[PDB]
Amino acid sequence: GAVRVSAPARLSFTAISLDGSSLRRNGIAAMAVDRPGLTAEVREAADGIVAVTGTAEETARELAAALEALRKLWDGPAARVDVLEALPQHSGFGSKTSTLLAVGHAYGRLCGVEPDLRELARTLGRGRTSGASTGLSAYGGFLVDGGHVNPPDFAEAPQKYLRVAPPKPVVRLDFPDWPVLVLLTHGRHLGGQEELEWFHSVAPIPAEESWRTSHLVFMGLAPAVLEQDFDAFCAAVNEITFTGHFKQAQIAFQGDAVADVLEAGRAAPSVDAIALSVTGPACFAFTKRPEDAERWAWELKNRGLIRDFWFTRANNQGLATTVVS
Amino acid sequence: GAVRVSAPARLSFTAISLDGSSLRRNGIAAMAVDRPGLTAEVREAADGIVAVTGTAEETARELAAALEALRKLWDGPAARVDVLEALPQHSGFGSKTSTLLAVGHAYGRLCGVEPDLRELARTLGRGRTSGASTGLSAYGGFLVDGGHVNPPDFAEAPQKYLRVAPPKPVVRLDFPDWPVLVLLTHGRHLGGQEELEWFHSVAPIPAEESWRTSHLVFMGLAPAVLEQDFDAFCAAVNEITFTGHFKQAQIAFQGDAVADVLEAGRAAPSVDAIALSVTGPACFAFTKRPEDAERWAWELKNRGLIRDFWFTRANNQGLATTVVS
Ligand SMILES: Nc1c([C@@H]2O[C@H](COP(=O)(O)O)[C@@H](O)[C@H]2O)n[nH]c1C(=O)O
Ligand SMILES: Nc1c([C@@H]2O[C@H](COP(=O)(O)O)[C@@H](O)[C@H]2O)n[nH]c1C(=O)O
Ligand code: NA
Ligand code: NA
């Protein structure tokens, strides 16, 4: 037998609370989509040897380590995982957390265990700052996690904390039946030390900017999703993309390759709103005229301003498993 | 037969978005408690004449009008409602909405109808600004509604809007198993035109203040509730009570009678946090030392600084109905 697992990608709108005086830090607004997706089959390894196929080396080593640990934890068989459809690594799709939880849950099912995904996340050391991928793995839809309570020492040295349980979702909603335009831009994958050094230049952000981001997320995005108000939703997405303090810093860190696409989407009458997922290269867009947006993205792809584009829709469930032979 | 309905009071922490440039207006953070409570019995009026007992005149006239309308709407019998336990009127307990929805739903049950409470609210003209009482009637617990999308004209004349469907809850959580100390202060019930004139002096509030209130609510109160973090919860409640721009204006409008109690609660080591519900007179407090807080409130009541006090707990369900004879 095999356990077949499917999971959605995570698209992130913004991180919220990154100032040096707030009661809490982090917080992520995010949604789940069908494409790109993860599709993987977990079965007993014939030779009793853990085996991983169909991912980049970093994720494959990490899946092997996860399977060797869960094998010891649940006293299960050595597993092979064949990843038939991989989430693109370090592209703004939340691939590591989404894949570790999907495969872990699947191996869990193979072991006759039904794991808590927040616990599995903890066990595999995921969602230290973000609860987005962890929550969407469980629920799908649109979600905002409440990040982490800040300690009394926080105001003194905000840089030590900002950088064991993943934040639970303070908002979880079904995403309306609106199509999502995914835009794969030209974008570098960021340099670990270049990134840490970049983050320590931008953060802590002004307190007022944390507050405005909470306001745009909780009193902009989230009610628009809940009330299925397309115009309200797009107004909030654009306010985040084009005015969000931390988002602006992410766009500038990625540079012209992403900025040119966001400005093109804003300019285009076929694109009602557009966003950068994390630091990309994945951007995502909303349109009440997808026929027009298709034609717009096809020309950007021809010109070589983007590498690729596709329409997808929200996943309002999270991961799914089937037994197959 | 009779339908016996019980419903919790609504305690309000703060209104959120009351500036002249925000994507949305209003928004309420609130919770449901057992005491004060509503307890009412709805039966067929023997003489075929609508009858209301056990409330103040304003609410009684309004319940009669509601029963005469729902009678016509659902083609039901003339009802009598005996309100055995009334929510105190205009005291910060959300009595009108809570009572209209409880009695309407009960009469509904008498008519063999199961009404949508948001629709019933609309029908009876409730939750024009607040969704707090409407949502807590349905769910109980702790909730934050997302208020109302602001029109394009809003930025021009914010005063026209600020002042048909009630806002749905963007956050709904179970309240943890913490006791709530209710403090009934000396407080005037506000003058309709004194209030409208007061509101037009304070609102619109600065944009930065709207943003900080969203931040304290969504990235303060709500995650603390979700994670059952008492110290985090109290830190957020106090930040709202003592620094909330709009809350400060409500305290100053009510004056010394409420301000003296809030300052006493803040000063008291037995009171970890305290809040004013709307403009009161009801305040409410949290304590990890309720034995000490009991002794503190007993002395304030003896001295005559408060009229009354009681402990209660959260109601995590909303209204409940039973059939009785
Ligand atoms: N910069 C991040 C992250 C980081 O990605 C990593 C994976 O996250 P998940 O896939 O577990 O959700 C985390 O380390 C988080 O810091 N998330 N959202 C953002 C954002 O800017 O919106
Ligand atoms: N100033 C209000 C109101 C008003 O009370 C009335 C009843 O509300 P519900 O009982 O339907 O929730 C509404 O008209 C609202 O404007 N609510 N919360 C507040 C607050 O300051 O927190
Ligand atoms: Na556009
Ligand atoms: Na105190």
Author numbering:
A (entry chain AAA), B (entry chain AAA): 10 to 172, 180 to 341
Q: What sentences appear in the manuscript?
A:
In the specific case of formycin, the enzyme ForT catalyses C-C bond formation between 4-amino-1H-pyrazole-3,5-dicarboxylate (APDA) and PRPP, in a reaction that is driven by the elimination of CO2 and inorganic pyrophosphate (PPi). ForT catalyses C-C bond formation in formycin A biosynthesis, and we have previously determined its structure complexed to PRPP. This structure establishes that ForT is a member of the GHMP kinase superfamily. ITC measurements show that APDA binds to ForT only in the presence of PRPP, suggesting that the reaction likely follows an ordered bi-bi kinetic mechanism in which PRPP binds first and creates the binding site for APDA. Glu211 is essential for catalysis, and we suggest it acts as a general base to make APDA sufficiently nucleophilic.
By contrast, the L24A variant exhibits only a small reduction in kcat but a 20-fold reduction in affinity for APDA on the basis of both the KM and KD values. We were also able to observe structural changes that take place as a result of catalysis by solving the X-ray crystal structure of the L24A/CAPR/PPi product complex to 1.75 Å resolution in space group P41212. The protein structure in the product complex is almost identical to that seen in the binary complex (RMSD of 0.41 Å over 319 overlapping Cα atoms). The loop at Ser174 is disordered here similar to the binary complex and in contrast with the T138V/APDA/MgPRPP ternary complex. The location of free pyrophosphate (consequently its interaction with the protein) is identical to the pyrophosphate portion of PRPP in the ternary complex. The Mg2+-binding site has been eliminated, however, because the CAPR ribose ring occupies a position intermediate between those seen in the ternary and binary complexes. As a result, the 2′-OH and 3′-OH groups hydrogen bond to the Thr138 side chain and a water molecule, respectively. The single carboxylate group of CAPR hydrogen bonds to the side chains of Ser21 and Gln266, in a similar manner to that seen for that cognate group in the T138V/APDA/MgPRPP ternary complex although the carboxylate atoms are shifted between 0.6 and 1.2 Å. The heterocyclic ring of CAPR is ‘flipped’ relative to the APDA and the extracyclic amine is within hydrogen bonding distance of a water molecule, but this water does not bridge to E211. The simplest explanation is this orientation is a feature of the L24A variant used to obtain the structure.
